Ligand SMILES: *[C@@H]1O[C@H](CO)[C@@H](O[C@@H]2O[C@H](CO)[C@@H](O[C@@H]3O[C@H](CO)[C@@H](O)[C@H](O)[C@@H]3O)[C@H](O)[C@H]2NC(C)=O)[C@H](O)[C@H]1NC(C)=O
Ligand SMILES: *[C@@H]1O[C@H](CO)[C@@H](O[C@@H]2O[C@H](CO)[C@@H](O)[C@H](O)[C@H]2NC(C)=O)[C@H](O)[C@H]1NC(C)=O
Ligand SMILES: *[C@@H]1O[C@H](CO)[C@@H](O[C@@H]2O[C@H](CO)[C@@H](O)[C@H](O)[C@H]2NC(C)=O)[C@H](O)[C@H]1NC(C)=O
């Protein structure tokens with residue numbers, strides 16, 4: 001196909017076109033982006049004296065453990081304590097382990113920060129060393145540190161010890177331990193609360209993010225981060241919804257909540273840690289507010305919304321408020337960030353097409369109140385565009401689609417036929433998730449993708465050339481879900497996978513990176529791809545440099561020649577760079593082969609005419625300078 005590139009831009013490419021969609025799903029938060037290594041670190045939201053309350057915790061030797069509703073809890077937010085007892089006549093090391101999130105990476109090049117709260121609930125004459133550390137589950141101690149504790153310490157006391165492994169573990173099958181001497185400890189009971197083990201964190205933020213994951217997110221050059229959900233915003237009930245104020249301040253004061261993907265969220269990854277991350281990566285937030293619906297199916301009645309509307313105002317005030325004018329803005333100042341953060345976009349709820357009967361009145365009351373408080377914020381509706389009819393008129397819709405790779409390339413013209421009437425669109429949740437149109441949400445046996453494939457990434461890439469072409473109205477687009485702990489998956493495929501030790505960058509990750517990093521501010525119209533065809537492209541240009549990004553998605557099984565005609569330009573560079581992601585249709589980056597499919601960079605000859613053969617199942621970026 002001959003592709004003529006117009007030198008006259010048709011529109012400015014939004015700065016926000018490519019970004020991330022995040023909630024705590026597949027242990028993306030706890031066990032993932034949040035650096036905390038202990039699972040169930042503070043016994044949040046578990047029933048005392050049950051096995052499940054002890055989840056991730058194990059005795060060493062004849063230790064007696066129970067999670068108790070502590071008569072004197074470490075805080076109002078953390079009512080549960082680990083009751084540790086050493087039987088009479090004990091000897092040797094007695095204590096307990098935390099297995100982490102399906103392991104703990106033990107790296108001798110890292111310093112770990114261990115901490116816990118303890119008291120003796122009954123004063124004793126105990127005198128001895130409390131030892132914390134890392135051991136292999138095979139039984140080798142790799143790191144240890146200790147401090148002197150006394151049985152007369154009946155008030156909650158924090159212990160803070162660094163750990164230095166003598167050796168890196170050969171695998172992540174390692175545990176955190178706490179021990180005391182069994183003879184010195186015989187007959188003692190100690191209550192513990194609020195454990196923590198941190199590796200070094202991204203940007204050395206002290207309640208921060210796991211470095212390799214945070215760096216992988218930053219790598220993708222995202223412009224925005226939509227948070228905190230997603231289903232995980234909504235709760236199963238009103239009472240279990242995400243609440244901003246429960247996620248800020250001291251970890252002692254965060255009660256956590258049962259999330260919407262089968263596990264407790266610590267809320268250690270809380271509103272301030274999110275905003276701090278955005279500051280660290282140059283991302284701007286698309287912040288969701290809860291909108292009076294939870295996943296059990298309960299809508300708040302119109303006459304129940306006011307306190308939830310105020311809580312949404314509170315949440316936004318924490319982010320952007322003048323600290324002199326609201327308690328939440330003063331709270332942000334009190335936590336060391338007096339300067340407001342950036343916030344231009346707020347999403348009202350999540351997938352309110354599931355509650356399309358009540359969203360009209362929920363949208364109406366929330367947005368009337370919020371737009372009056374925050375006239376410069378753009379509020380994003382979550383129902384199907386224009387059905388139901390919303391008031392006030394939404395300035396933006398969040399459009400979701402899970403579909404087959406084929407659907408993505410066949411629907412690259414999704415936005416071409418939309419009216420340009422000041423409405424902007426956020427493709428806030430999309431992925432090619434299955435090769436089976438008849439069973440998108442099914443098993444891997446029935447066509448579900450366990451990981452993104454070259455097929456899925458190339459289909460998505462074709463769809464993305466359509467998002468870029470239509471970026472006069474499409475302002476934002478994010479793959480979902482973003483993150484996956486391979487040992488705790490509720491949803492596949494996911495953009496970026498990991499275990500306790502390492503990260504797997506998907507084919508779809510590389511498509512997202514190639515699209516986001518090679519994106520100018522000018523959209524250059526070109527010959528239109530065939531609507532329904534496998535081959536798509538999108539061309540943008542950096543107005544400051546003339547760097548021209550020709551992105552090509554071949555989503556089909558056949559190589560396809562493109563001849564680019566740039567005769568309208570005064571000059572084109574005599575060479576360009578080519579970045580290509582390709583491989584076999586069903587090839588995937590997996591835990592076992594995490595670099596099977598990676599982009600390759602070369603130099604190609606260019607000028608006002610050049611020909612490129614886009615391979616079957618390829619994402620290609622050709623970068624030339626045009627003036
Ligand atoms: C985060 O902030 C929200 C408010 O934005 C706090 O929720 C509010 O908590 C109070 C105290 O529990 C609730 O008041 C209570 O309501 C019941 C039920 O009718 C009443 O029987 C009690 O005497 C009391 O008035 C209030 O309704 C609730 N509001 C909302 C919007 O949920 C929340 O507690 C804060 N979370 C944390 C951990 O600080
Ligand atoms: C045991 O942990 C303690 C507490 O973290 C370590 O002592 C700290 O060492 C760092 C770095 O040298 C200093 O900045 C702190 O001031 C120290 N604090 C105290 C109270 O000493 C100690 O190095 C650790 N020991 C081992 C063997 O890992
Ligand atoms: C912008 O244009 C869209 C089409 O892309 C309009 O959507 C129609 O809106 C009415 C209700 O207001 C619905 O009953 C129709 O079914 C919608 N059409 C389609 C094709 O979805 C939309 O109203 C326009 N918005 C503004 C602000 O003018």
Ligand SMILES: *[C@@H]1O[C@H](CO)[C@@H](O[C@@H]2O[C@H](CO)[C@@H](O)[C@H](O)[C@H]2NC(C)=O)[C@H](O)[C@H]1NC(C)=O
Pocket residue numbers: 102103486487499591592
């Ligand atoms: C977490 O998931 C990883 C990756 O799937 C598991 O490690 C794999 O285990 C399989 C099947 O037992 C092995 O044959 C693979 O070679 C392993 N892959 C890698 C890259 O190591 C790991 O066992 C899981 N952890 C837990 C605790 O279940």
Ligand SMILES: O=S(=O)(O)O[C@H]1C[C@H](O)[C@@H](O)[C@@H]1CO
Pocket residue numbers: 023025229230231232350351400402429480481491
């Ligand atoms: O029913 S789903 O399609 O899983 O919902 C998707 C959409 C929702 O915003 C998010 O939580 C979830 C996983 O990406």
Ligand SMILES: [Cl-]
Pocket residue numbers: 404405406407434435436
């Ligand atoms: Cl398909």
